[PDB]
Amino acid sequence: MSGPERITLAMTGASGAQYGLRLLDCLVQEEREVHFLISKAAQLVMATETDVALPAKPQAMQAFLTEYCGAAAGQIRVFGQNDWMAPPASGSSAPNAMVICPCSTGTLSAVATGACNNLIERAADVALKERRPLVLVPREAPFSSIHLENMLKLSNLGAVILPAAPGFYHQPQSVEDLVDFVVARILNTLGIPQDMLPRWGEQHLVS
Amino acid sequence: MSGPERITLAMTGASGAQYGLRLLDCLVQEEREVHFLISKAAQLVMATETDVALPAKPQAMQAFLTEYCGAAAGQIRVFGQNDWMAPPASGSSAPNAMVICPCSTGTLSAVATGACNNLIERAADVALKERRPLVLVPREAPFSSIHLENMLKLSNLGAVILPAAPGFYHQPQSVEDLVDFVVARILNTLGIPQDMLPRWGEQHLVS
Amino acid sequence: MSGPERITLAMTGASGAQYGLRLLDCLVQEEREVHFLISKAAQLVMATETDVALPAKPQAMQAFLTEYCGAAAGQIRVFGQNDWMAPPASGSSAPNAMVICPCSTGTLSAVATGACNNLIERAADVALKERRPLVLVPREAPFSSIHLENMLKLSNLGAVILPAAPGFYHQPQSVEDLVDFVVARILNTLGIPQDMLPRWGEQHLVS
Amino acid sequence: MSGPERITLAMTGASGAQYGLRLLDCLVQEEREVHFLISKAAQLVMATETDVALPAKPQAMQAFLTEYCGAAAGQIRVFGQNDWMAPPASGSSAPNAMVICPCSTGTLSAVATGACNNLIERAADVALKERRPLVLVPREAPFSSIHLENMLKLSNLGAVILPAAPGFYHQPQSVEDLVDFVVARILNTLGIPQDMLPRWGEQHLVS
Amino acid sequence: MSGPERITLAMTGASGAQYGLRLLDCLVQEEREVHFLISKAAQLVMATETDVALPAKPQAMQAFLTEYCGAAAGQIRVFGQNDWMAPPASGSSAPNAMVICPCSTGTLSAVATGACNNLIERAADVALKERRPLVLVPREAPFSSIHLENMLKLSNLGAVILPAAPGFYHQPQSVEDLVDFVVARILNTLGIPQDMLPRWGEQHLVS
Amino acid sequence: MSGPERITLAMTGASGAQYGLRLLDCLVQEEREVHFLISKAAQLVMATETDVALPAKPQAMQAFLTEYCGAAAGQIRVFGQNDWMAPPASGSSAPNAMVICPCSTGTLSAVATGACNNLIERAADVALKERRPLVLVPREAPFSSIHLENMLKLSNLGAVILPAAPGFYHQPQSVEDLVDFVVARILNTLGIPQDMLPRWGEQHLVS
Amino acid sequence: MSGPERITLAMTGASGAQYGLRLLDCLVQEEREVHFLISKAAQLVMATETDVALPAKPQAMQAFLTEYCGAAAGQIRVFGQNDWMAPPASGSSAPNAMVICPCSTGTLSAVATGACNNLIERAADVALKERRPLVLVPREAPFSSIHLENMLKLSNLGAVILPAAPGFYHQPQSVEDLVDFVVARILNTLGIPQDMLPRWGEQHLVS
Amino acid sequence: MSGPERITLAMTGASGAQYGLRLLDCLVQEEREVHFLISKAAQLVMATETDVALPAKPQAMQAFLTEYCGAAAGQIRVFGQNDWMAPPASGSSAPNAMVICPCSTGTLSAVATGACNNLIERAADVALKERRPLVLVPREAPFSSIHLENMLKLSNLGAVILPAAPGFYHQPQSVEDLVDFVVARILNTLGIPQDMLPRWGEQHLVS
Ligand SMILES: Cc1cc2nc3c(=O)[nH]c(=O)nc-3n(C[C@H](O)[C@H](O)[C@H](O)COP(=O)(O)O)c2cc1C
Ligand SMILES: Cc1cc2nc3c(=O)[nH]c(=O)nc-3n(C[C@H](O)[C@H](O)[C@H](O)COP(=O)(O)O)c2cc1C
Ligand SMILES: Cc1cc2nc3c(=O)[nH]c(=O)nc-3n(C[C@H](O)[C@H](O)[C@H](O)COP(=O)(O)O)c2cc1C
Ligand SMILES: Cc1cc2nc3c(=O)[nH]c(=O)nc-3n(C[C@H](O)[C@H](O)[C@H](O)COP(=O)(O)O)c2cc1C
Ligand SMILES: Cc1cc2nc3c(=O)[nH]c(=O)nc-3n(C[C@H](O)[C@H](O)[C@H](O)COP(=O)(O)O)c2cc1C
Ligand SMILES: Cc1cc2nc3c(=O)[nH]c(=O)nc-3n(C[C@H](O)[C@H](O)[C@H](O)COP(=O)(O)O)c2cc1C
Ligand SMILES: Cc1cc2nc3c(=O)[nH]c(=O)nc-3n(C[C@H](O)[C@H](O)[C@H](O)COP(=O)(O)O)c2cc1C
Ligand SMILES: Cc1cc2nc3c(=O)[nH]c(=O)nc-3n(C[C@H](O)[C@H](O)[C@H](O)COP(=O)(O)O)c2cc1C
Ligand SMILES: CC(C)=CCOP(=O)(O)O
Ligand SMILES: CC(C)=CCOP(=O)(O)O
Ligand SMILES: CC(C)=CCOP(=O)(O)O
Ligand SMILES: CC(C)=CCOP(=O)(O)O
Ligand SMILES: CC(C)=CCOP(=O)(O)O
Ligand SMILES: CC(C)=CCOP(=O)(O)O
Ligand SMILES: CC(C)=CCOP(=O)(O)O
Ligand SMILES: CC(C)=CCOP(=O)(O)O
Ligand SMILES: [K+]
Ligand SMILES: [K+]
Ligand SMILES: [K+]
Ligand SMILES: [K+]
Ligand SMILES: [K+]
Ligand SMILES: [K+]
Ligand SMILES: [K+]
Ligand SMILES: [K+]
Numbered sequence A, B, C, D, E, F, G, H: 001m002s003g004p005e006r007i008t009l010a011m012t013g014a015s016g017a018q019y020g021l022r023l024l025d026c027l028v029q030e031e032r033e034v035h036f037l038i039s040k041a042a043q044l045v046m047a048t049e050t051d052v053a054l055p056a057k058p059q060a061m062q063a064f065l066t067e068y069c070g071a072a073a074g075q076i077r078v079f080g081q082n083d084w085m086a087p088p089a090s091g092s093s094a095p096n097a098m099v100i101c102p103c104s105t106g107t108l109s110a111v112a113t114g115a116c117n118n119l120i121e122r123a124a125d126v127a128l129k130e131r132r133p134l135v136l137v138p139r140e141a142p143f144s145s146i147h148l149e150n151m152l153k154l155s156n157l158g159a160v161i162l163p164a165a166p167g168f169y170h171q172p173q174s175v176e177d178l179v180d181f182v183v184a185r186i187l188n189t190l191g192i193p194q195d196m197l198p199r200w201g202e203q204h205l206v207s
Helices: A017-028 A038-048 A059-067 A105-112 A119-129 A146-157 A175-191 B015-031 B040-049 B057-070 B105-114 B119-129 B146-158 B175-190 C017-028 C040-048 C057-067 C104-111 C119-129 C146-156 C177-190 D019-027 D038-050 D059-069 D104-112 D119-129 D144-156 D175-190 E017-029 E041-048 E058-069 E106-114 E120-129 E147-157 E175-190 F017-029 F040-049 F058-069 F105-113 F119-129 F147-156 F175-190 G018-031 G040-048 G058-069 G107-114 G119-127 G145-156 G174-191 H017-029 H041-051 H058-069 H106-113 H119-128 H145-156 H173-192
Strands: A008-011 A033-038 A075-078 A096-103 A133-139 B005-012 B031-038 B076-078 B095-101 B135-137 C008-012 C031-040 C076-078 C099-103 C134-138 D006-011 D034-039 D074-078 D097-103 D134-138 E006-013 E033-038 E076-078 E095-103 E135-139 F006-010 F033-038 F076-078 F097-105 F134-138 G006-011 G035-037 G076-078 G097-103 G136-139 H006-011 H033-038 H075-078 H097-103 H134-138
Touching: A008 A017, A008 A119, A017 A033, A017 A038, A017 A059, A017 A096, A017 D038, A033 A038, A033 A059, A033 A119, A033 F105, A033 H075, A038 F040, A038 F076, A059 A075, A059 B005, A096 A119, A096 D074, A105 A119, A105 A133, A105 A146, A105 C119, A105 E106, A105 E147, A119 A133, A119 E147, A133 A146, A133 A175, A133 D034, A133 F033, A146 B146, A146 C104, A146 C119, B005 B015, B005 B119, B015 B031, B015 B057, B015 B095, B015 B175, B015 H006, B031 B040, B031 B057, B031 B119, B031 C031, B031 F006, B031 F175, B057 B076, B057 D038, B095 B105, B095 B119, B095 B175, B095 F134, B105 B119, B105 B146, B105 E033, B105 G107, B119 B135, B119 G107, B119 G145, B135 B146, B135 B175, B146 H119, B175 C008, B175 H134, C008 C017, C008 C119, C008 G040, C017 C031, C017 C040, C017 C099, C017 C177, C031 C057, C031 G018, C057 C076, C076 F147, C076 G145, C099 C104, C099 F175, C104 C119, C104 C134, C104 C146, C104 E106, C119 C134, C119 F175, C134 C177, C146 E106, C146 E120, C146 F147, C177 F175, D006 D119, D019 D034, D019 D059, D034 D038, D034 D119, D059 D074, D059 E120, D059 H041, D074 F033, D097 D104, D097 D119, D104 D119, D104 F105, D119 F105, D119 F147, D134 D175, D144 G145, D144 H006, D175 G119, D175 G174, E006 H075, E017 E033, E017 E058, E017 E095, E017 E175, E017 F175, E017 H058, E033 E041, E033 F147, E041 F147, E058 E106, E058 G076, E058 G136, E095 E106, E095 E120, E095 E175, E095 H058, E106 E120, E106 E135, E106 E147, E106 H134, E120 E135, E135 E147, E135 E175, E147 H145, E175 F175, E175 H173, F006 F017, F006 H017, F017 F033, F017 F058, F017 F097, F033 F040, F033 F058, F033 F134, F058 F076, F097 F105, F097 F119, F105 F134, F105 H033, F119 F134, F119 F147, F134 F147, F134 F175, G006 G018, G006 G119, G018 G035, G018 G040, G018 G058, G018 G097, G018 G174, G035 G040, G035 G058, G058 G076, G058 G107, G097 G174, G107 G119, G107 G136, G107 G145, G136 G145, G136 G174, H006 H041, H006 H119, H006 H134, H017 H041, H017 H058, H017 H097, H017 H173, H033 H058, H033 H119, H033 H145, H075 H134, H097 H119, H097 H173, H106 H119, H106 H134, H106 H145, H119 H134, H134 H173
Parallel strands: A008 A033, A008 A096, A033 A075, A096 A133, B005 B031, B005 B095, B031 B076, B095 B135, C008 C031, C008 C099, C031 C076, C099 C134, D006 D034, D006 D097, D034 D074, D097 D134, E006 E033, E006 E095, E033 E076, E095 E135, F006 F033, F006 F097, F033 F076, F097 F134, G006 G035, G006 G097, G035 G076, G097 G136, H006 H033, H006 H097, H033 H075, H097 H134
Antiparallel strands: none
16 A cells, blocks of 8 residues: 555644544545544534534544444544553554644644643654654634744644645535545645545646 | 725735635725736636636726626726836835735745735735735645745734635535635735624623 | 723733733723633632632623623623633634733743633634734743743734833832733723823923 | 824934934924934034034924924924933833934944933834834945844834935936935825825826 | 752653652652652553552642651652642742653643643743753653754753763663662752762772 | 842832832841942932932942941942942952842843943943843833843843732732832842742642 | 956846946946846836936947947947846856946845846856855835845845935035935945045044 | 665764664664674773673674674674775765664764764765764763754754663563663664564554
8 A cells, every 4th residue: 555554633623624524534445544533622613513423532432433434443543632552642653644634723833842731742742753744734814923933843844734725726616625625635645545636737748 | 994995906826716806806895996916827827717717918807807896997907017107016105905815835935035026026025115914815735844934934024824724613515605714814804894704702792 | 982992801820910800990991892811820819819709600700790890791701711612712703902911921831832722822822813912911020031032922923011010100109009000001002091100201391 | 184193203313314304394294293302413414414503402402493394382392312201211101103314323223222322212112112103214325234134123023114215216306306205205104194205106097 | 968958859741750759769868858749641650660559639649658758747748730839839939959850742842832831830930930950851762853942942041951861881780770870860960969870980090 | 148248239220219229228138248330310210209319429329328228337339330440340350249120121231232331231241251140120011022132132141030020929018018029039039038028838738 | 447347237127227327327437347237127217217218129228328428339248138148147257346226126135035037136146156246226115124134144145235325414416416425335335436425534633 | 674774883982882782683683784883982882881892993893793693794894983985985875774872972963063074974974965864872961952952953954863761661670671672762763673662552442
């Protein structure tokens, strides 16, 4: 397979819960193992913006997402916000790529400063120290200078800052097509196959 | 009226021509005077992403947009890319707010470095030196460190960096609802009334 | 009216609870709408330094402060520390000026780094990104280099750093006169009328 | 009225005393209240470059300028260089816009470093801390890196650096027309009406 | 006595709980007063890495540690994570040296940014502002650039960054000898006598 | 004795002359030798804010302060603003701690830039180069970025920035109790005994 | 002869075409060889601000300027904007001093960033790399922070930033006298004799 | 095979010679080719801290280490400190990963500054310029700001700073278990299999 076998997928409390659920679904369809983390605020976002009725506790959440996605037993792990016995908490874990989608400005801040206050933040700290892939998907507008400095610091350290800023150059017809644009770029970044977004100009030879 | 009487609206060659056309339409409906500039690349974007058949030359373009938007005679000015006799080229002009929507990474760069190679770039240079409003609406993903440094520099100088990163917390049902989210935030930034996006929590008293 | 119609007033756990209560009282007397937030540590400060017996929960706190201040029904809103449905949590809210009085070194830090861990910190993050007024009133001595760097960063971004450092040039006779000095400068900063502190030299013509 | 009711006008010892006297005259004609400060070196410049015989002491200077300008009694205040009882010395004063015209490199330095050695320098320090308008009009050539760093620091803090560098694009015919160009840009910066310099392109609709 | 009479000893959730317990034991044997703080994560580390069954609540923990160490009544104080009435929370307290051993990357971050979210972090903030000794003992590998920037900032402000990186130049024979190496260097840093690690070259006169 | 035998006490022209006079009184009561310096502006502040009728010339001022404070002959030295033969002007002098209380923004600037224009500024320059204690007590609000950069630079070089920002956590009942709070913190900083402000939590053992 | 034998004189599209034409005339009268470059925008400025009817193409322009200035055949070279075979394009050319007069903000930007988009910009890039004289004469007001950073960078690298900011201390009587002031300072900078501006104080011996 | 076929292993004169010998042994057992370099000071460390009697000259050292490790002929190359004909001296060499274990503060400095004074330092310079793996294993405590700046610079350039700071979370029972912890993390960093340190949480599915 091309790309990572295991992805840590963290959802934090920015608007755009649809992006994180669609990415989860694509990762599952690509037979990847997902270590799923979700913040309390992201739970409130998902309740507000979607009709997904996500259970609160990790085992119930795991059972629910496995069914929602059509996943295999064991394919989605769920870990709670203080579960330091989970693989993402240590750099001695097997290597995973990590994506924070969506990424709140508060989570962006914590990652940029090294605040390590829950498993999402620690997981990101471990990805950086181990030089494992780290993709942040912020959703905010305007971005203040606070936000921008935090994104620049992490981009300079090799994190990929991938704003939830979809393109329109494949004539999107629905909200889903815009969601899938962003998801496709995340999968592209990770080196995971996707067929939602064609390869630009692949068939163009000259002019 | 609340907000500026005159807006310089520059469209550059990032994906998201729909945002610039919808903002133009809203500004016209709010009885504002618009000084419209468009780059050659933005013309190619508009041809690719939309069914708007925009004429190439400024007078024909002006006639076309006046009709497209339902504007009054004289309400949309169009100026070509080297027209230094246009108001935006000089800080001795009457004051305008300026929005670059969408803003390509190349236009972002030119504004951040002071490159003054066409009227859009000069207009932005004048807005900064005169401390007149300047709003950039970049559409790109990932953002590299190049992009982020350019956005940070301009944000620190009082430009508003407003990525084309719509929210989902009003349960959007169509591409248009996402377009209108971004447009609403631009109008909010400018201090121009809009009723596309409600005032969050306006009716919430306690808890 | 001169100055903002709505002020977000956040009290955090620095010494100087008297300043925040007096400012609240002045804002109420000036017929402003106040969105009141208070941290858990600020509750402990208020219990230690004052004889105000503030209820713990937002609705009871709202009822209590409305009575304490002589406010109109609805004039003081109180929002709890995780209430993301409150106006201050979103930049799509109606615009407010925000004052953090007093501002702990920990809240100063969170605002400077963009940590967004409760509604006070998120509210400040939103004020900065929206270029809405943000006034911090730190109370600390000595200030370390940590403190000073955090204040400088925010001052450079247009926040007003207004230490709780009263002047003596109007011959204060009581603790209240010193409290009112600081409050007056906050109201001056906000553009709200006050008659506690005269306009210096207003009547001086020459020499 | 558009623009500030009160301007603090400080003349320092750069060449270009004509600019400061013409601005004073325009401000008076626009019915503004002027708080006038002049350095000892600026007195020597005025004696060298002009035929204005300015008295040395503040009351005599005030009487003289009131007559020279056709001002109303009380409209021009003059304050001496150590008069800390004057409004500009305190941020608790009524708000004024401040212009230093012309601005010597030494005054530029003092403002950039916060040196507070006379009332002009303190007044500028107060304008910055209160986020009241501050316009500096340097006259120097070449500018060294010392000069440029000082101007950049203050520009980054929201001061307007407006060099005495007139334009020629309205075909000036006299020294006075060049003086009036610079004065017009200062008044433009302050938001005060002026009809010396037309609004560029105001009548240009297309091309 | 040489060295401080009172040490604030904070244990945070890095691996190396043995270092903190051994330092506590040495401090007790040197008749020092210890103000002991421990984070929730450090409690989980101690449970995982050692057979010390530490009670959870401060009074029970105090009784337990007094017995474990052979301490005098009152010699070990224990304070909970929000106990702002404890001496370390205020710079008006009697002076203490502070050691964070072990120091997690998250606690390192909080100290470097001034986040003041529990008593350990506030205590460190107070040590820095009062220019009282502050020793951090990080245990992490690799160190990322996040970690290193945080350590550099604090080292530049006079904190001692003392990694849990034992030496081998006294031919250690056990895990305990390595633990005691690090502890000895902490005591050396604090100016407290120790005889675990000889003074290098003390008896070497020439060559 | 604990703390320095000799303190250079400089009063500059910020509001808060009461702080400097009370500190002088405490230092005298602690049998310290004081080298007293006062700026011309500080003389004007003392005349405005207090009923102390301080003579202008150093010998008369010395006689006056010796009486005002109950000092021993020779215990208060007074030196004029250009007296380079005074001990504070040279690092070859016997070592003193220096406190600038209150510290104007102009004196803060001069110390931060090394301007050495009077004996107070030179004395501070000498304290820094000799790594002798230097405590600045600024009184200003808001602090601008100018102020904050100057304070940060000096704090990074080991000066203590101690704003005149009293605490309220010992339930102050008078202006004097607030003055004494600040004075106590200065004496704490210097290592001089004081009993105005208790040691926080000294009697708290657990919880 | 004192000063350079060859000057590259580039005119760019800032207001102040009179300065560039007068400098050209003085250089010709001093028997210097001039390599003349002019941007398209500078052609539009010259048409607007002057009655010089400058031909568009380099050979016609050369013939025209030779006549306008009274120059010898071959004394004024003109090179077009993409003529890389011209001496200024290579550092292996014979050495020239270069002056950009007037210098637009866009040309200032290009030189500061190394953009090399036409022969003027490349010529400046070559002057810097060869440590040959480079004088920029900007004409703009206000200068923004963009402008100032670009000028500072180049000043730090040894370029001379000489704003078109004439002095008045030789009692100018006409627009020409102000033009000649600036020209004189450029010639002074280059080490070329001029008698338009006397040597200040040359005859002053004492006082 | 996973990971690099060739590792340049440099031992420098920090304490911790055991780490370098154990890593050498593991690399040999994993059938990797090792290019071994050792500094003169590291020879003195090995003599002091271990009972390995390492010959001084490269051929004798090679024979000795081949036997000590059970290596194949040709599997360990040894190169002397000025042998510029060795592969590590040139980026045109076949690619190797490089580890400096242990890394003295002096070698850390040389690598950070580009000092190229022996083959170890040149080899590291080549690894950085070729973007080949470079892992430094410093052993020092405290780390000064000198050390930390050097580590930060190299970490920012993509070197891995892996302090000799073992963890205790697998209940180490001997000095060897601590040595093997660090070695395992180096092998993890390099992508070489190891079974000394389990993959954290690999078997944890939920909670
Ligand atoms: C409905 C809703 C939408 C939100 N949208 C955003 C958003 O788009 N971006 C953002 O940075 N925060 C947003 N927030 C706020 C955060 O959720 C808040 O700052 C929180 O502290 C983030 O915490 P977390 O990073 O632990 O998830 C939203 C909150 C809610 C309830
Ligand atoms: C269909 C199309 C879509 C594009 N989308 C983007 C985009 O989303 N962001 C971007 O920075 N550039 C985009 N580009 C590229 C630019 O248009 C290109 O870099 C151009 O030089 C911008 O020039 P301008 O700033 O003068 O408009 C796009 C180009 C085309 C043709
Ligand atoms: C009585 C009392 C007084 C305090 N005084 C201060 C103070 O003056 N400045 C400060 O930064 N923290 C002070 N603190 C500490 C904070 O309250 C503490 O650092 C807390 O974490 C701040 O949290 P908050 O920012 O969420 O309110 C005080 C605490 C108490 C209990
Ligand atoms: C006739 C004359 C012209 C001057 N022209 C300038 C000038 O153009 N720019 C400048 O920075 N200083 C000029 N100076 C010098 C200053 O006046 C001098 O540096 C002085 O210290 C400025 O002090 P001030 O800032 O208190 O006015 C001039 C002085 C005189 C006497
Ligand atoms: C068994 C165990 C070992 C840990 N080892 C480390 C470590 O060596 N370094 C580290 O920075 N964090 C380590 N952590 C993680 C932290 O404990 C986590 O990031 C936590 O948020 C730190 O919180 P604290 O600073 O409040 O103690 C470990 C956690 C556990 C459970
Ligand atoms: C009554 C009075 C009160 C003042 N209060 C302050 C103040 O609180 N802070 C300040 O920086 N300057 C204050 N100033 C201004 C200064 O005294 C002024 O900037 C002066 O140049 C300081 O000079 P010095 O540093 O030599 O004492 C005050 C002046 C007077 C007359
Ligand atoms: C009449 C006229 C006057 C101008 N005045 C200025 C000016 O004073 N300063 C400036 O930076 N640009 C001025 N401009 C704008 C520039 O000419 C424009 O930004 C252009 O892109 C500069 O290109 P160039 O650097 O290749 O000459 C002026 C333009 C015209 C037409
Ligand atoms: C026994 C011994 C132990 C040493 N331990 C260390 C150490 O732990 N860290 C360190 O930086 N230097 C240590 N040094 C010092 C260095 O070896 C010394 O600074 C040397 O110049 C390093 O040179 P190199 O980098 O060429 O190996 C030690 C030296 C000896 C003899
Ligand atoms: C949860 C845990 C074992 C953290 C330690 O991991 P690492 O050694 O810091 O990568
Ligand atoms: C097009 C034109 C007149 C540019 C000059 O404007 P400004 O004086 O630089 O603001
Ligand atoms: C609570 C909420 C709707 C946060 C999103 O606000 P914004 O779009 O980030 O200004
Ligand atoms: C002259 C005077 C009262 C200075 C104090 O003003 P502010 O409180 O520093 O703004
Ligand atoms: C817990 C408490 C009294 C904090 C205030 O201490 P300090 O005045 O900030 O050193
Ligand atoms: C007044 C005097 C002797 C200044 C010289 O002191 P130092 O040698 O600069 O410390
Ligand atoms: C036009 C040309 C030969 C450019 C190369 O010049 P140089 O070697 O870069 O100074
Ligand atoms: C020892 C040698 C051939 C050094 C040159 O290598 P490279 O071309 O600098 O990578
Ligand atoms: K959470
Ligand atoms: K174009
Ligand atoms: K709270
Ligand atoms: K003066
Ligand atoms: K805790
Ligand atoms: K003085
Ligand atoms: K051109
Ligand atoms: K060597």
